[PDB]
Amino acid sequence: MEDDAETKAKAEDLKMQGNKAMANKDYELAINKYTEAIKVLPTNAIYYANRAAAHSSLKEYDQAVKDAESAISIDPSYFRGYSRLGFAKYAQGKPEEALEAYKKVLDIEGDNATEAMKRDYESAKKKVEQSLNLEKT
Ligand SMILES: O[B-](O)(O)O
């Protein structure tokens, strides 16, 4: 990748800067770094999945959903976009949408699904049940 050697190095540098910010709970800075990384190289779903996580840590779930949906569109075989979508939907009180997203994680990963991925799916399913049970007039 000679033509985009500078572009890719810069996008990955920005990504790493955003990841350090995320580790330090500087979610505002992480978001700005991931946003610049996407501008430099907009074909990498990881940057959108990372930005979705930062938005969710700030309880900015509408923006997290948008970024997760972008990650899914850019790489539909990448499970993490669906995990980020499911977390944001779950936190928004949309557990049926979260369940579908976490189920897709399990379908993608198949027999390679981790116990944490299974727990995510089961948590969403439980929240569907809880939400129904809590209905009042
Ligand atoms: O547009 B909302 O995510 O239902 O508030």
Author numbering: 92 to 228
Direct quotes from the study:
The yeast ortholog of SGTA, Sgt2, is best understood in the context of post-translational insertion of tail-anchored (TA) proteins into the ER membrane. Sgt2 captures TA substrates after they are released from the ribosome and passes them on to the Get3 ATPase, the central targeting complex, in a process mediated by the Get4/Get5 heterodimeric scaffolding complex. Sgt2 contains an N-terminal dimerization domain, followed by the conserved, central TPR domain and a glutamine rich region toward the C-terminus. Importantly for its role, Sgt2 associates with several heat-shock proteins such as Hsp104, Hsc82 (yeast ortholog of Hsp90), and Ssa1/Ssa2 (yeast orthologs of Hsp70), which can bind directly to its central TPR domain.
In this study, we report the first high resolution X-ray structure of the Sgt2_TPR at 1.55 Å and also in complex with the PTVEEVD peptide corresponding to the C-terminus of Ssa1, at 2.0 Å. The TPR domain of Sgt2 consists of three TPR repeats, comprising six almost identical α-helices and a C-terminal “capping” helix (α1 = A96-N115; α2 = Y118-V131; α3 = A136-L149; α4 = Y152-I165; α5 = F170-183Q; α6 = P186-E200; α7 = E206-L225) connected by short loops and arranged in a antiparallel fold homologous to that of SGTA_TPR. A structural overlay with the equivalent human domain is shown in Figure 1A (RMSD of 1.13 Å over 135 Cα). All residues were built into the electron density map except for the C-terminal Val229 and the solvent-exposed sidechains of Glu93 and Asp94. The final model also contains 90 water molecules and a single BO4 ion from the crystallization condition. It likely relates to the fact that the TPR domain helices suffer a subtle contraction to enclose the peptide in the TPR groove. The crystallographic structures we have obtained clearly show a slightly more compact conformation of the TPR where helices 1 and 7 are closer to each other in the complex structure than in the unbound TPR (See Figure S8 for a structural alignment).
